[PDB]
């Protein structure tokens, strides 16, 4: 029984030796061809002509594919509002118009570049500001409201109002999007090898495209080199085009995107704009809050509606607000459709909440920790969406982080550094988070597994979840080993496939361990019950002897397992019903030093205390906390996507888009997991960990703001209670310009 032990990721040794196989590492068939997407260079335009003359002169050119080649249907995407191949009009730079197929990827690259498209430009809508001005939205306003707003504000000592923007983020999974499609030649059957978190939609979108039943399409996923939400639906853009080429040619076909194509085409986190108004007492006690959210959804719905719902569920962070109104709108723009990115709308909404909370504290001239603490939910409290907080552990996390980070002592020393230094300043902030666990769409909270014991007693486990680095398969092996009471060496997970576990939800919402853990567990229980008589007959025997006896007595050693998360069903009409199963909680305290003269900064130290219940694997769970935190630090402090005015992405590679490096991480980086906090609601008292830590990254942003505040108090108009706008990400540009001095002027 290894549950609770820091067992390393099962594949890590093979990952270190270069033996682990990712999609493009699969050998090529002798007749395998290569696909490359031909993409829009205009944000909004009619397609006038497509000329392939030059492409046809490229050695090894096979064909050009376009909407006219599709046998089944050109309508695709989650809400059936996308094309597989654009027909008359393109609606973003990156919009897929067609594909070349060639005998080598180099020849496909060369041929694609020489495909000539003629456009007639149409007027484009790129910014959130543009979309609002044109009422260019998907669907209607989303809203959560509680209490009496025109009572709260009537009562408030003060108000703060303003506007905040947070930029998007590219996923930058180290392995880009990849599909191999193998046409069988019989009955429209096709087998697909795909770097995707959603083998179900892949399968369904390929079949729809082809005009073929879903039972003809087999999708297999060994592992991804990262997904982070980005391979949850947008992987089909490559998969469907590759399936089409396989169908047309009758040959195997593959495509792996180059980084620049991937950044342009496949979408990122949603940029958010927020307009807010908070009313509060002289004490810093919040009495009213009104926030209007706007997301830049891009050129299709995709997951944008659910991402806004999640934002609205997290606009409270860990704070009790008696009177509250949040609204969301989804901006329809001529940009690549934006999608799931780790946090799924939560970090954006949580950041908006911490931004005004920080401005409340400044306005009242109180310590930031004091204002946060005094507004914090208490055990038993209801959220603005009327769900009770049971086992609310932020108070413990807060107390322990304050103590172990030595926050009050170091706050003193920050102040001393600031009084002793002119052109460098230190900041220090401590921030909480809560993150609700479940898909907010009730029907996705289902999970299947399938387990076989073979006659040598070795066990093959299959579940609907996929491995992208998060150690899900490791965790499922620890679960099965514990449940079957056999060592992990007897159990194997090979891959995720639609022919072993059908209709699976995407591997998403941080719930995979919870839901597949339960499926695996139930299947193991079924096995144990079937084996029990044989155990009784041969009590001093071995697992192997029991299995073989069951086999020879014609007892089935194969079973399914299923879990359906109970009691979920939030209603926007009644503002009731649980939206989440439980919440994951955490607190981070971060210190930075800024260079007032350059806008550069150094992350000095970070301490995190995270409630992950009783961890299934502390090493994986700490690894998840550190990974998420650093992705969040990149979102808020480093990573910036930049577009031309005509809506074309400039930042298309690691030289223009900076994700955190070895040297970006805090010099002192401490993560602890909260002790003695079992979670009754999930497998073996554990809690979801994948997404909840990312927002803690914001602690570095508010530490930066705190340091800018000190720099301004030194060189500009001195009002202690002076507020200024700092959007996310806080890049060197923004940090420097905000340090107003004799040089900026």
């Amino acid at each position: 029984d290894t549950v609770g032990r820091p067992l390393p990721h099962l594949a890590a040794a093979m990952q270190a030796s270069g033996e682990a196989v990712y999609c493009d590492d699969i050998p090529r068939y002798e007749n395998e061809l290569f696909l490359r997407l031909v993409t829009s260079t205009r944000a909004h335009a009619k397609i006038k002509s497509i000329d392939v003359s030059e492409a046809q002169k490229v050695p090894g050119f096979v064909c050009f594919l376009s909407a006219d080649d599709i046998p089944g249907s050109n309508e695709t995407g989650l809400f059936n509002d996308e094309t597989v191949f654009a027909k008359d009009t393109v609606t973003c730079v990156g919009h897929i118009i067609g594909a070349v197929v060639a005998d080598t990827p180099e020849h496909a690259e060369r041929a694609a570049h020489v495909v000539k498209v003629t456009y007639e430009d149409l007027p484009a809508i790129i910014t959130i500001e543009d979309a609002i001005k044109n009422n260019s939205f998907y669907g209607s306003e989303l809203k959560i409201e509680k209490g009496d707003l025109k009572k709260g504000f009537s009562e408030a000592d003060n108000v703060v109002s303003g506007e905040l923007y947070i930029g998007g983020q590219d996923h930058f999974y180290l392995e880009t999007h990849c599909t191999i499609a193998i046409p069988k030649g019989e009955e429209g059957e096709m087998e697909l090898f795909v770097s995707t978190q959603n083998a179900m939609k892949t399968q369904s979108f390929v079949a729809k495209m082809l005009g073929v039943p879903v039972n003809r399409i087999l999708v297999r996923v060994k592992r991804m080199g990262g997904g982070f939400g980005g391979k949850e639906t947008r992987s089909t853009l490559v998969s469907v085009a590759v399936a089409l080429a396989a169908y047309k040619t009758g040959h195997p076909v593959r495509c792996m995107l180059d980084r620049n194509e991937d950044m342009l085409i496949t979408g990122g986190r949603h940029p958010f704009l927020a307009r807010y108004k908070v009313g509060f007492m002289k004490t810093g006690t919040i009495v009213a809050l009104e926030v209007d959210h706007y997301s830049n959804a891009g050129n299709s719905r995709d997951l944008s509606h659910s991402i806004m719902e999640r934002a609205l569920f997290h606009m409270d962070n860990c704070y009790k607000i008696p009177n509250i109104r949040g609204t969301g709108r989804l901006c329809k723009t001529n940009l690549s459709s934006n999608t799931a990115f780790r946090g799924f709308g939560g970090p954006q909404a949580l950041f908006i909440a911490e931004n005004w909370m920080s401005e409340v504290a400044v306005t009242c001239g109180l310590p930031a920790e004091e204002v946060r603490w005094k507004n914090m939910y208490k055990e038993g409290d209801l959220t603005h969406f009327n769900q009770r907080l049971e086992g609310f552990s932020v108070p413990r996390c807060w107390d322990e982080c304050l103590k172990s980070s030595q926050y009050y002592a170091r706050k003193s020393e920050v102040d001393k550094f600031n009084k002793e230094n002119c052109w460098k300043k230190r900041g220090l902030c401590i921030i909480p988070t809560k993150f609700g666990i479940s898909f907010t769409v009730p029907f996705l909270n289902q999970a299947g597994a399938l387990i076989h014991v073979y006659t040598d007693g070795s066990v093959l486990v299959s579940h609907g979840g996929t491995e992208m680095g998060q150690g899900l398969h490791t965790k499922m092996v620890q679960v099965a080993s514990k449940a079957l009471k056999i060592p992990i060496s007897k159990i194997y997970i090979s891959e995720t496939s639609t022919n072993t576990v059908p209709n699976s939800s995407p591997t998403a919402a941080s719930v995979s361990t919870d839901i597949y853990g339960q499926a695996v567990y139930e299947a193991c229980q079924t096995i144990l019950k079937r084996l029990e008589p044989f155990k009784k007959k041969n009590p001093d025997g071995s697992w192997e002897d029991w299995v073989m006896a069951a086999y020879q007595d014609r007892v089935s050693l194969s079973t399914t397992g299923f879990y359906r998360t109970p009691n979920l069903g939030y209603s926007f009409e009644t503002n009731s019903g649980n939206a989440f199963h439980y919440f994951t909680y955490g607190v981070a305290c971060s210190e930075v030093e800024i260079d007032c003269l350059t806008g550069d900064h150094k992350n000095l130290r970070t301490d995190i205390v995270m409630d992950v219940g009783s961890s299934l694997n502390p090493a994986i769970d700490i690894g998840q906390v550190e990974g998420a935190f650093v992705q969040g630090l990149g979102l808020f402090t480093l990573e910036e996507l930049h577009y031309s005015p005509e809506g074309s992405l400039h930042t298309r590679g690691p030289s223009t888009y900076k994700i955190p490096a070895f040297g970006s991480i805090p010099t002192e980086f401490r993560v602890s997991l909260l002790r003695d906090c079992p979670n009754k609601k999930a497998i073996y008292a554990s809690k979801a960990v994948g997404e909840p830590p990312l927002f803690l990254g914001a602690s570095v942003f508010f530490a930066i703001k705190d340091a800018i505040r000190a720099a301004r108090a030194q060189h500009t108009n001195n009002n202690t209670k002076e507020l200024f706008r700092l959007d996310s990400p806080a890049t060197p540009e923004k940090i420097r310009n905000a340090c107003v001095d004799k040089f900026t002027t």
Binding site: P59, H113, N260, G663
Partner: protein, 194 residues
């Protein structure tokens, strides 16, 4: 060590074994691209879709690889990798009075968080210079210091301190069609010079 010829679908590459071959080849093919590290040319061909049908690789030539410590400065062959320049300069800095290494120290500051080991082990000095990117981190140091450039063609030879005139316009430098950059003398700093 002899001259090698490789021929592909769109490109002919000649690996020059001697300085004479290089200068002869550059005279015959004035437009040829000189590849060493390929960290610029490989990018222009992949991402700007440029085609350069004639490439000469001079990385083998002893004169483009020579590190020479003189009275006025340290001279590096144009093909010297940035990690070699770094190591030579780190060695000079630890050995010489601080007052002679102000420029070396500047070059070393620009080299610090300049890519990673992989790029710096193959990127040439001459490559960064002749590329002449508006955002080259080395050209401003070389210009400010008046780093001396030895430029060579078949027969002719010259040494010019780098000044503002060396970069007339976008991605252009003041070398004639038949010319190559041969070596780069980075000067010791003087008394009362910072």
């Amino acid at each position: 060590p002899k001259q090698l010829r490789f021929e592909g679908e769109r490109v002919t590459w000649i690996q020059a074994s001697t300085l004479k071959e290089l200068l002869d080849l550059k005279a015959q093919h004035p437009e040829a691209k000189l590849v060493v590290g390929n960290t610029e040319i490989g990018i222009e061909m992949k991402f700007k879709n440029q085609l350069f049908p004639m490439i000469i690789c001079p990385a083998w030539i002893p004169e483009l690889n020579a590190v020479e410590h003189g009275p006025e400065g340290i001279s590096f062959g144009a093909a010297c990798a940035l990690s070699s320049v770094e190591k030579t300069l780190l060695e000079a800095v630890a050995k010489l009075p601080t007052q002679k290494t102000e420029v070396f120290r500047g070059v070393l500051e620009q080299l610090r968080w300049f890519a990673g080991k992989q790029v710096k082990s193959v990127a040439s000095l001459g490559g960064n210079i002749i590329t002449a990117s508006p955002i080259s981190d080395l050209n401003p140091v070389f210009m400010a210091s008046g780093t001396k450039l030895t430029i060579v063609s078949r027969g002719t030879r010259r040494t010019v301190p780098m000044d503002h005139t060396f970069f007339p316009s976008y991605r252009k430098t003041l070398l004639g069609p038949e010319e190559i950059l041969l070596s780069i003398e980075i000067p010791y700093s003087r008394e009362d010079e910072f």
